Amino acid sequence: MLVKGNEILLKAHKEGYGVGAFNFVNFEMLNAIFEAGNEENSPLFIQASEGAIKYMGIDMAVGMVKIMCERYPHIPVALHLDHGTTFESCEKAVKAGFTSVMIDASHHAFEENLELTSKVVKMAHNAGVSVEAELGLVNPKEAEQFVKESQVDYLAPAIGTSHGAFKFKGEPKLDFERLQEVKRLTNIPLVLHGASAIPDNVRKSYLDAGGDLKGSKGVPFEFLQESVKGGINKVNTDTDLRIAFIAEVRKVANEDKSQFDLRKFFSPAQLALKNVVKERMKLLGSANKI
């Protein structure tokens, strides 16, 4: 059923596994994520970006999740605001029924990031909602102070991905010892952003269907595995889902120019997305944890 984000992530923190945090923008994505969690007996951490909330309406985003929870009442589910950019966006998500909110002030200096994060924490904790923040590479002693003073529930430290305020050109490299130091000093669940791991079969599906991935690479599965070993407990996953889904839409469009039954496009798209989610749950170690 619907639970606070910290309930899912504290278990992962204690037991040393990662929970994929899977984005959705509509019914098809959400259904595939839930079926994957059901088939792998995995907790579900469901994310909606601010753009997804604008697209669906926050009432529909929460409403569809509540319907799905009732359909699979044995699965723990958290509903998380991904990259909230203002206090008011986080508060609206809290009021609408989200059970986790992320405030991204990582482009601000330490003091301003801490101040806004703490304000979000005060509001969210009063409503029983858990909070994620982001900090950058990160200095572990600054992360220690940031966590202790803010009371944030989980932190996304900049540890080597090209993402957000910490974009760089070049092969990403995981700073494992830095990760371990952040983990040891903060003793909270940690979150990895910017780690798309386009599986070989998904890449092939997308290219075969005529797609172009313009030298976009993501990271190898080993990067994700090593990150979990080092204490990452939440792995944001969106890009990989979209590529798998749209590969099947492109394929249907290519192979039958007369096809306009939406279900003929979106049933195979859901299946491909579901399979990405299932494999990611197995890779990160949340399978069979419910």
Q: Is 271 in the site for a second copy (CB under 8 A)?
A: no
Residues 226-245 that bind a second copy (CB under 8 A): 239, 242-243, 245
The length of the chain is 290
Asked whether position 112 contacts a second copy by CB under 8 A, the answer is no
Q: Which does 64 bind (CB under 5 to 8 A by kind): Zn ion, a second copy, Na ion, none?
A: a second copy
Nearest distance from C-beta of residue 189 to Na ion, angstroms: 12
The residues carrying an active-site annotation are 82
Please state, in angstroms and rounded to a whole number, the distance separating the CA atoms of residues 61 and 71.
16
**Residue 82 touches which of Na ion, a second copy, Zn ion, none (CB < 5 to 8 A by kind)?**
Na ion
85 is in an annotated binding site: no
Site string (90-119) toward Na ion, x via CB under 5 A: ------------x-----------------
Q: What is the pattern of x (binds a second copy, CB under 8 A) and - over residues 70-109?
A: xx--------------------------------------
Exposed/middle/buried for residue 215 (C-beta within 10 Å: 0-12, 13-18, 19+) = exposed
Query: Crossing angle for the helix pair 262-284 and 221-230, nearest 10 degrees?
Result: 50
Q: Locate tokens 């595939």: which residue?
A: 32
Other CB atoms within 10 A of residue 214 CB: 5
Q: Return the residue of 246, 275, 289, 290 that touches a second copy, per CB under 8 A.
A: 246
CA-nearest of 214, 6, 226 to 128 is 6
Which of the residues 196 through 225 are near a second copy (CB under 8 A)? 206, 210-214
> Looking at beta carbons only, is 164 or 172 nearer to Zn ion?
164
Number of neighbours of residue 153 by Cβ within 10 angstroms:
23
> What are the E-state strand segments in the chain?
19-23, 44-49, 77-84, 100-103, 130-135, 154-157, 190-192, 232-237
Nearer to a second copy, 49 or 145 (CB): 49
Helices (H), 151-238: 176-186, 200-208, 221-230
Nearer to Zn ion, 83 or 274 (CB): 83
- Does position 67 interact with a second copy (CB under 8 A)? The reply is yes
Terminal C-alpha separation, the chain: 11
Cα–Cα distance between 19 and 11 in angstroms, integer?
Answer: 10
Phi and psi of 28, rounded to 5°?
A: -60, -45
Please identify, using beta-carbon distances, which residue of 117 and 236 lies nearer to a second copy.
236
164 binds, among Na ion, Zn ion, a second copy, none (CB under 5 to 8 A by kind): Zn ion
To the question of whether residue 42 is assigned a binding role by annotation, the answer is no
CA 163 to chain centre: 13
Among 15, 261, 282, 288, binds a second copy (CB under 8 A): 261
Tokens of 99: 């059970």
Q: Which of 28, 82, 240, 248 is in the footprint of Na ion by CB under 5 A? A: 82
* Residue ranges in contact with Na ion by CB under 5 A: 82, 102
* Residue ranges in contact with a second copy by CB under 8 A: 25-29, 31, 51-52, 55-57, 59-60, 63-64, 67-68, 70-71, 206, 210-214, 239, 242-243, 245-246, 249-250, 253, 257-263, 265-267
